Design a protein around this ligand. Structure first.
Ligand SMILES: *[C@@H]1O[C@H](CO[C@@H]2O[C@@H](C)[C@@H](O)[C@@H](O)[C@@H]2O)[C@@H](O[C@@H]2O[C@H](CO)[C@@H](O)[C@H](O)[C@H]2NC(C)=O)[C@H](O)[C@H]1NC(C)=O
Lengths: 208, 196, 217, 210, 216, 208
């Protein structure tokens, strides 16, 4: 059983934000919601679809219908910026959603700049090959990176960092594709696709 | 003869999970048992008492017959319900109208039990049965009953803010009992053969 | 108020066993609650491991059932977790939590959670990094790749601290080998290429590594 | 155990008035009595012949039991379920007295009915039946097809022939027609005979008395 | 007098759900009446969907029973319709009506009816039309205005100069979800070779203006 | 349960027209009748076989016997020209008749002219193929259109408009047969049969 969430959502301070959670016949199950801030433990904000624990502000509310559960935060505040998870139960297993990052907009939106480096000639001599994709100067700090080899998706050998705040307060991230010299020459093209706020930017390198 | 301990008459007939005089537990999910005193008097003058299946739980192909459970009736740490009766709830986003009838073709009188759930609030009514305004119709040649669930928040008994009301009748040979409901129906699976 | 507290080693060699214990305060294990373990790898989602009741009854995540065990000590008011045959994928923050049943329907909610504890699974030891040039192809971007070092941290400067503008040093990444890696990039005008020399200064004190690399065109 | 009625009258309960509010679980009774003032008597308006005498009779009774004597499905040439009125609603739709059957025409035909039931019980049977007095001629054709009709009821102690009085009457429960109900005590080994070509309200359930 | 009023989304995408509500004024839902839904596709017959009683009792059209739901809100004095998994065949005008029981026998009559509301099932979005010539072999010639969305399209001939013998047909909704119509003009055969004919198609929703000359 | 009605009837002003409704054992059921004018809601004219609602003129009457119910309108007027539906109940379902269009003859009868257009040369290049059958200058406004491919009936891809009044007050109608270029070339002939007042007119086209 899978609970699907959007990876990230944005909301201006004072506005209302929606967090969705999808699963098969979710409307028959009771859903719960947890808030997690960086470096802290999850906090129950909504249990049993619509119920609030004591000490939880009234602006938090939840609902469930069909195959989609929704956490709603009205009059959102800066302290509400966190990761949010939904959870349900199915066949002797508790299931957590993939998680949604909620950003309260405190600065203008910035597009990411993408730089892709092919393996250096020196690394190839050491019988190694690492593709480096650098992502910087973007807001909010949410990003999806996808690697492509000859137009086909790549999962093996991909390692990616979590977005981190720069000095300017604009987030940055990096992604590495580790290959062998043989694998590197095997394909004719490689791509580093970076998705940020519905916009996808890619860079390309070719083995010569 | 069957001498009971701890569990009540209502509890044993319904199938209270912890159950298998002064009873510690009457109903695990809080509520009432109508004509209880009369039933006990009736179950006094009995020569033979036997349990029979009249409506198989698997026969509910359009409704959910196992998911509905309460913490008030625990079994092995997890939520459960009365064994002999079925807590029907919505399957997917739908609760189709129930039209079911069982005819007693035995040579003995049948003790049939059924119930209605009075949910905590409106939000719970939709969650369990989907349909907002619902009813239960129970008919025999001698019985005419129509029930409407009373949606209200009550004091927590066994952790429940809702209640259940249970009913019973004697189905004579060649007489049939008819059920119709679009929600809040706690349906019988097992009945009891009795002999005076 | 009920409080839960995780405790355990935090460093485990591959093929070894992660052994954690959860102390329960403000409440008794012998309750109608269930007691659960949840883990989270860095920058990833929550994953349910399993649960236990005070009677000893358990339920596990089917994908972990092969190598996971959960027990409970009613007298010492705690419950514990054993995860054997561990890999780099088992490096995560582990939470213990209290689970309460809904009044109606299956399932339950998790409250409260423990503070959590990090368990690192890596056979790695102190190792020096390799340094490779990231040559460029209006401005241009060039950098240095600092690969396979342990442990943190690594500092990178450019032209011995003379060049600081346009310099961005990215945070480290934890590879599946258990070894860190990072990059340091600097954006410079394209025309200055060839009329200016750029040198990155990688330093890894734990291995006494001082590497200067000139990034060519 | 006695049968104390609430809301519903004796005539309403005997005929099986849908609108009667009563929970009833034990099909074994000694006797039956109604409240001094019943809220609903007949759902479809009409009269109950020898009502006072019947109520008195059902007072001093040692055993009261309900039995089916003529199954609704046994009417293979007539329609036994389609005939209904809004005056006797059940779950929002038109319905009728449960214990008696409002027979109407099947297709364009209402064949003459010749049915007889013999009391093979060891107890006296309370048998009830009725006739429908339709609103006008147009309704007579609509329900029973035949224009001029009759009802014949015979036993060893009873000889009855009824002719429907077709007339427009004041609307009671939305009905401008009426129904007249009759009853007799069928002794053991005695048989009751019915003959009709229209307007017949046939019994399905009778009552064993002691 | 009792009045009934339908309202809801007039455009619904395929596999989606038609969600309508019927407001009742001048009378109470809590009556001996039944409350029903009836639909009619353009230029076709009436079809009974289902009905509901204030107690919650319902009866549906068996051919629709799989994907239909009817509920009632006594507090707001309304009842509603839900039709899921919709197709192009579900494009119709939807009526709500009040049903009254006969004094004797099953059934009833529908009075009064609501004004009705059109629900279009199409996955289409704003699109400009293609225009093709309907050339003649008196004689008849016209223009085919195909695959546009949504309504309407206005067609004139020679910038409004030619109006006699001109008929512009109603639009039709194809199974693709795009509308189509034609505009024809009947003319004498001898005039064909000696006269030029130009149709002027206009589709405001997409701001499309197409002039097409019909040849021989 | 099916209720069958005649598709259309004609009647001179002042004369009487009868509208029939047929179904299995209809004589046992109460029948109702509704008047619907174009773009308006149905109007109850007869309920319970013979009863008239308040505000309904006396010249309207109905009857039922056997398997056929009849709506009768004496002294017909121009305001009586509309569509008429019968209605009944059977097995938990309400059933409406197929509908009858009643035209009061206000002008002389006119035969329809039929013109069938093959797909245009421009449309075929656009990977489409639409056959257009235009019907015009006919009275009354009642027509049945049937499409044939090599003499075989076609329902799939058929769309037909309802008759509409022209400038001259003579009704017109149109029917479309939508095909793919492949489907179009597959057959050697296509036909558009038009029925009006018992008379059938057809036109035929062939891909050449
Ligand atoms: C967030 O979503 C709500 C939607 O409200 C409903 O609840 C959801 C859980 C889901 O079931 C939706 O399908 C529901 O519509 C938005 O608020 C509604 O907006 C609609 C207009 O589309 C309006 O008709 C409703 O009245 C609104 N309801 C409320 C309570 O405000 C809201 O706009 C969404 N916010 C964002 C930022 O997308």
């Amino acid at each position: 059983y899978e609970l699907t969430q959007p990876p990230s959502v944005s909301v201006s301070p004072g506005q209302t934000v929606n967090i969705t959670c999808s699963g098969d016949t979710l409307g028959d199950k009771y859903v719960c919601w947890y808030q997690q801030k960086p470096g802290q433990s999850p906090v129950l904000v909504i249990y049993q679809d619509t119920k609030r624990p004591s000490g939880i502000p009234e602006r938090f509310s939840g609902s469930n219908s069909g195959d989609t559960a929704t956490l709603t935060v009205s009059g959102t505040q800066a302290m509400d910026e966190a990761d949010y998870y939904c959870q349900a139960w199915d066949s002797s297993s508790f299931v957590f959603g993939t998680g949604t990052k909620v950003t309260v907009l405190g600065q203008p939106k910035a597009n990411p700049t993408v730089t892709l480096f092919p393996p250096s000639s020196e690394e190839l001599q050491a019988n190694k090959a690492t593709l480096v994709c650098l992502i910087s100067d973007f807001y909010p700090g949410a990003v999806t990176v996808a690697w492509k080899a000859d137009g086909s998706p790549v999962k093996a050998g991909v390692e990616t960092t979590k977005p981190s705040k720069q000095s300017n307060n604009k987030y940055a991230a990096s992604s590495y594709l580790s290959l062998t010299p043989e694998q590197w020459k095997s394909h004719r093209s490689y791509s580093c696709q970076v998705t940020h706020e519905g916009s996808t930017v890619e860079k390309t390198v070719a083995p010569t | 003869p069957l001498i009971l301990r701890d569990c009540s008459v209502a509890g044993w007939l319904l199938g209270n999970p912890m159950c298998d005089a002064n009873p510690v537990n009457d109903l695990c999910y809080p509520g009432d048992f109508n004509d209880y005193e009369e039933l006990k008097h009736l179950l006094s003058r009995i020569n033979h008492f036997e349990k029979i299946q009249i409506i198989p739980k698997s026969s509910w192909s359009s409704h959910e017959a196992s998911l509905g459970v309460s913490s008030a009736c625990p079994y092995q740490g997890k939520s459960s319900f009365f064994r002999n009766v079925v807590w029907l709830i919505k399957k997917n986003s739908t609760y189709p109208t129930i039209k079911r009838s069982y005819n007693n073709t035995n040579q003995e009188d049948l003790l049939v039990l059924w119930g209605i759930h009075h949910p905590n609030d409106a939000a719970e009514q939709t969650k369990l049965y989907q349909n907002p305004t619902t009813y239960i119709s129970v008919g025999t040649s001698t019985l005419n009953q129509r029930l409407v669930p009373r949606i209200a928040t009550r004091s927590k008994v066994n952790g429940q803010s809702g209640r259940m009301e249970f009913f019973w009748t004697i189905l004579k040979p060649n007489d049939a009992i008819n059920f119709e409901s679009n929600g809040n129906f706690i349906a019988p699976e097992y009945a009891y053969k009795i002999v005076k | 108020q009920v409080q839960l507290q995780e405790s355990g080693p935090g460093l485990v060699k591959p093929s070894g066993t992660v052994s954690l214990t959860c102390a329960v305060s403000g409440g008794s294990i012998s309750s109608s609650y269930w007691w659960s373990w949840v883990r989270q790898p860095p920058g990833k989602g929550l994953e349910w491991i399993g649960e236990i009741y005070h009677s000893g009854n358990t339920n596990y995540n089917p994908s972990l059932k092969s190598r996971v065990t959960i027990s409970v000590d009613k007298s010492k008011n705690l419950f514990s977790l054993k995860l054997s045959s561990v890999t780099a994928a088992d490096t995560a923050v582990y939470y213990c939590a209290r689970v309460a049943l809904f009044d109606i329907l299956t399932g339950g909610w998790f409250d409260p959670w423990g503070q959590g504890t990090l368990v690192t699974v890596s056979s790695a030891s102190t190792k020096g990094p390799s340094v490779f040039p990231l040559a460029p192809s209006g401005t241009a971007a060039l950098g240095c790749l600092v690969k396979d070092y342990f442990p943190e941290p690594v500092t990178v400067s450019w032209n011995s601290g003379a060049l600081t503008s346009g310099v961005h040093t990215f945070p480290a990444v934890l590879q599946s080998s258990g070894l860190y890696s990072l990059s340091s990039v600097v954006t410079v005008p394209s025309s200055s290429l060839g009329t200016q020399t750029y040198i990155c200064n990688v330093n890894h004190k734990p291995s006494n590594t001082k590497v200067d690399k000139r990034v060519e065109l």
